Amino acid sequence: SQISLLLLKEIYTNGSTHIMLDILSVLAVISGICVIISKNPIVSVLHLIGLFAYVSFYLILIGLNFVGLSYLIVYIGAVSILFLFILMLINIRTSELQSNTSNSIPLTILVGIIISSFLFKMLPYGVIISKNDLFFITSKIWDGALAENNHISSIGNIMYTNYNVWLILASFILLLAMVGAIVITIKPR
């Protein structure tokens, strides 16, 4: 007699608002806009450190802590630091890097439409999943929850055994970036 389907809020085991994702998208976009329009390369790298943070939080917020923390440790931690070193030691006259940006507005208009109209069709349904709105539903499992692993233990269970060839190539790419970058910069002895 009464409606069989019943919808009610969750009092304690709740979760996060999906509103935060829409905020973190906006700032990531806003931060990214300032990267490619800023006059000073120091400032653009700062807007890059901001973008890497917003994307890192976006991922932590949706459950991907190890890689979201890996982005923090790797990009903001170390790559942008190397960028800051070089950019704070190279002499930069901030007017020789400034080009007439107003000319390229029409080409910005043109290439924005063409790329956006094509690539968006390529994306899968799950990524563009976000008036009757579809709700995603989840339920518990017991056989699959016996000894659950964090994402880093799951990556580790296969990173060094089944897909270990990927580790070999990466070890050699990092090793080449060591030898090659040392040999093209330093004066021997």
Partner: protein, 87 residues
């Protein structure tokens, strides 16, 4: 949809750049953060750990291009004294 927009930002960094070889360095990394970010969000959708791992190896190759890229840019600056493009 955020992944595609952030890809455009990297593209548009190549559209608006006549003088910054540093912004060309930057926009390549914005483009890499789009593609890694897209792989990751689809991995959460399909319950696959290989998408997570593929992101990890993209992050490691991305840092290595920064070392090679900033190393070569140092070698150029030593003999040039300027990163500027006369135009």
């Amino acid at each position: 949809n955020i992944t595609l927009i952030l890809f455009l930002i990297g593209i548009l960094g190549f559209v608006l750049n006549r003088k910054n070889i540093i912004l060309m360095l930057i926009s390549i990394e914005i483009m890499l953060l789009s593609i890694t970010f897209l792989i990751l969000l689809s991995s959460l959708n399909m319950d696959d750990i290989i998408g997570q791992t593929y992101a990890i190896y993209i992050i490691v190759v991305a840092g290595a291009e920064s070392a090679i890229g900033l190393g070569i840019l140092v070698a150029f600056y030593r003999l040039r004294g300027s990163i500027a493009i006369e135009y």
